[PDB]
């Protein structure tokens, strides 16, 4: 990498809700420029999460491209969230640097769809569902999620995450295709 | 010279419930008899309805008046403590009027803070307000909550005009009755939001509505005076008041940002505090509520 300018857009504050409304506003900004704006490395991560409980974040240290970081600077579709949301400016960066990656991608961690397929095809009985349907149906762990509004459940929901281990080497790539990361930029330093 | 036993102060700015109805885009010049929101059921039981697949602008329909008369407690016992309270309130009335509180309530009525989650999703949040003393129009108003910010204290000329007319209703010598009609462009096939009981929703006669205490606490969102981090701006105003969705206590009793220290020094000791602390005192005396142990 021969460039030292990589930033992103963090979450904006407001008093009309908890941080789930800020997560919904960040999902709207991602659908406008980052997640629903195409490309691989268009997401929103945060290095303010602990590995013991899968926290969501407390600050904003973004790392993405230039168009997705410069389209959410003067757009008029961020009313209210732009009452507290802001940022600084660009500058130069250091010459050396590592290639570390951590993000959250769309994984298959729901035992409802596979169970629905096994009910539409297998037609399991009681003892047959207790023996052939194994004890790997409670598939859920503590992951980073915020209150996502959508017509899939009644109220707001949660979500998991998944990334890979990085090092001090050099490399570059993209994140998931839903507004997350798979080895992209996260908050570190 | 001591405290009275039971202090009753009724709710000024007394609100009502917020009806919902659905209209379409560019069909909204006749917003008088739109079809309302009925309670649907889909498969705990989540009986939460959606907007229809044709209409998208949710007309939120509610009104508001001002009782007034905060110079007299609705229940007291003492004679000299009451004379001290009456002369202190008369000192404020001879000191300054209701302009600042009316403009801050206009800041509440300029953005869409009264819609707690219904603000996100809408495209052009237009606030239609008529003037009512009888069953007709006398003066009209149109807003937009995307050109008007959320946290920033700004008072435009139209907001100053509406806040001045509200303050003319507020001063105790003239009655005003102003409603709010908002347009939540939720979409064609997206969720309606009534208030929730203790799913456990709320509904009215052949329609759906939202509770009134949530409006009554949303319109008093003034509090920028908590010492930890004021990057979030205005929050709810109560003695020991804060937001209960975060989990953090604002206006600590360890500092002097409490109403009770202000009332004790402001009535008993004659150690009168400053102007903005008196604005907080009269804000949480104009919200109503119980006082006294």
Swiss-Prot record, chain A:
Alphabetized CDD domains for the sequence: Cas6_I-F (cd09739)
Cited InterPro entries: CRISPR-assoc_prot_Csy4, CRISPR-Cas6/Csy4_sf
Reported impact of residue 150 to A: Cleaves pre-crRNA 8300-fold slower
Cofactor: how bound: Metal-ion independent.
Consequence recorded when altering residue 106 to A: No loss of pre-crRNA cleavage, still binds crRNA
Keywords for this protein: Antiviral defense, Endonuclease, Hydrolase, Nuclease, RNA-binding
GO molecular function, one term: RNA binding
A GO BP annotation: maintenance of CRISPR repeat elements
Natural source organism: Pseudomonas aeruginosa (strain UCBPP-PA14)
UniProt-reported outcome of changing residue 31 to D: Cleaves pre-crRNA 910-fold slower
Family stated for the protein in its record: Belongs to the CRISPR-associated endoribonuclease Cas6 family. Cas6f/Csy4, subtype I-F/Ypest subfamily.
Protein name: CRISPR-associated endonuclease Cas6/Csy4
Positions bearing the site annotation: Substrate binding: 150
UniProtKB/Swiss-Prot annotation, chain B:
Protein name, per record: CRISPR-associated protein Csy3
GO biological process, one term: defense response to virus
Keywords: Antiviral defense
Null allele phenotype: Mutants lose phage DMS3 infection-dependent inhibition of biofilm formation while there is normal biofilm formation in the absence of phage infection. Decreased production of crRNA in the presence or absence of phage. Disruption of the entire Y.pestis-subtype CRISPR region disrupts crRNA production but does not alter phage resistance (possibly OLNs PA14_33350 to PA14_33310, and the flanking CRISPR loci), indicating this CRISPR is not involved in phage resistance.
Organism of provenance: Pseudomonas aeruginosa (strain UCBPP-PA14)
InterPro entries for the chain: CRISPR-assoc_prot_Csy3
One Pfam family hit: Cas_Csy3
Annotated family: Belongs to the CRISPR-associated Csy3 family.
Function: CRISPR (clustered regularly interspaced short palindromic repeat) is an adaptive immune system that provides protection against mobile genetic elements (viruses, transposable elements and conjugative plasmids). CRISPR clusters contain sequences complementary to antecedent mobile elements and target invading nucleic acids. CRISPR clusters are transcribed and processed into CRISPR RNA (crRNA). Cas3 and Cascade participate in CRISPR interference, the third stage of CRISPR immunity (Potential). Involved in crRNA production or stability.
Additional remark text: In this bacteria, Y.pestis-subtype CRISPRs do not confer resistance to phage DMS3 or MP22, but instead are required for DMS3 infection-dependent inhibition of biofilm formation and possibly motility.
Subunit structure: Part of the Csy ribonucleoprotein complex with a probable stoichiometry of Csy1(1),Csy2(1),Csy3(6),Cas6/Csy4(1)-crRNA(1). A Csy3(6),Cas6/Csy4(1)-crRNA(1) subcomplex is also formed.
Record-annotated membrane-spanning stretches: none
């Amino acid at each position: 990498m021969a460039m030292d300018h990589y930033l992103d857009i963090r979450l904006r504050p407001d008093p009309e809700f908890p941080p789930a409304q800020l997560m919904s506003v960040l999902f709207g900004k991602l659908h406008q420029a980052l997640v629903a704006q195409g490309g691989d490395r268009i997401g929103v991560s945060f290095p303010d999460l602990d590995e013991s409980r899968s926290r969501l974040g407390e600050r904003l240290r973004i790392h993405a491209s230039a168009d997705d970081l410069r389209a959410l600077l003067a757009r008029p579709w961020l009313e209210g969230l732009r009452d507290h949301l802001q940022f600084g400016e660009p500058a130069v960066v250091p010459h050396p640097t590592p290639y570390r990656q951590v993000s959250r991608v769309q994984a298959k961690s729901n035992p409802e769809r596979l169970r629905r397929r096994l009910m539409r095809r297998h037609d399991l009985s009681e003892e047959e569902a207790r023996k052939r349907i194994p004890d790997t149906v409670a598939r859920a762990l503590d992951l980073p999620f915020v209150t996502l509004r959508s017509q899939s459940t009644g109220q707001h929901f949660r979500l998991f995450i998944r990334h890979g281990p990085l090092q001090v080497t050099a490399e570059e790539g993209g994140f998931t295709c839903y507004g997350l990361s798979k080895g992209g930029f996260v908050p570190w330093f | 010279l001591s405290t009275a036993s039971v202090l009753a102060f009724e709710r000024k700015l007394d609100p009502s419930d917020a009806l919902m109805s659905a209209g379409a885009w560019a069909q909204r010049d006749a917003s008088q008899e739109w079809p309302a929101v009925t309670v649907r059921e889909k498969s705990q039981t989540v009986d939460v309805a959606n907007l229809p697949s044709d209409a998208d602008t949710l007309k939120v329909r509610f009104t508001l008046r001002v009782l007034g008369g905060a110079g007299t407690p609705s229940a007291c016992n003492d004679a000299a403590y009451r004379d001290k309270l009456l002369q202190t309130v008369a000192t404020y009335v001879n000191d300054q009027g209701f302009a600042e509180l009316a403009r801050r309530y206009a800041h509440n009525l300029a953005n869409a803070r009264f819609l707690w989650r219904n603000r996100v999703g809408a495209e052009a949040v237009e606030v239609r307000i008529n003037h009512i003393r009888q069953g007709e129009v006398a003066r009209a108003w149109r807003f937009d909550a995307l050109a008007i910010g959320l946290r920033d204290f700004k008072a435009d000329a139209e907001l100053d005009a509406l806040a001045e007319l509200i303050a003319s209703g507020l001063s105790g010598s003239g009655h005003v009755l102003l409603e709010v009609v908002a347009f939540a462009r939720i979409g064609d096939g997206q969720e309606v939001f009534p208030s929730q009981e203790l799913k456990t929703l709320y509904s009215v006669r052949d329609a759906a509505a939202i509770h009134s205490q949530k409006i009554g606490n949303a319109l008093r969102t003034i509090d920028t005076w908590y010492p930890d981090e004021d990057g979030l701006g205005p929050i709810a105003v109560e003695p020991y008041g804060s937001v209960t969705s975060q989990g953090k206590a604002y206006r600590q009793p360890k500092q002097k940002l409490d109403f009770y220290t202000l009332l004790d020094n402001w009535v008993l000791r004659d150690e009168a505090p400053a102007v903005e602390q008196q604005h907080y005192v009269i804000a949480n005396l104009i919200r109503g509520g119980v006082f006294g142990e």
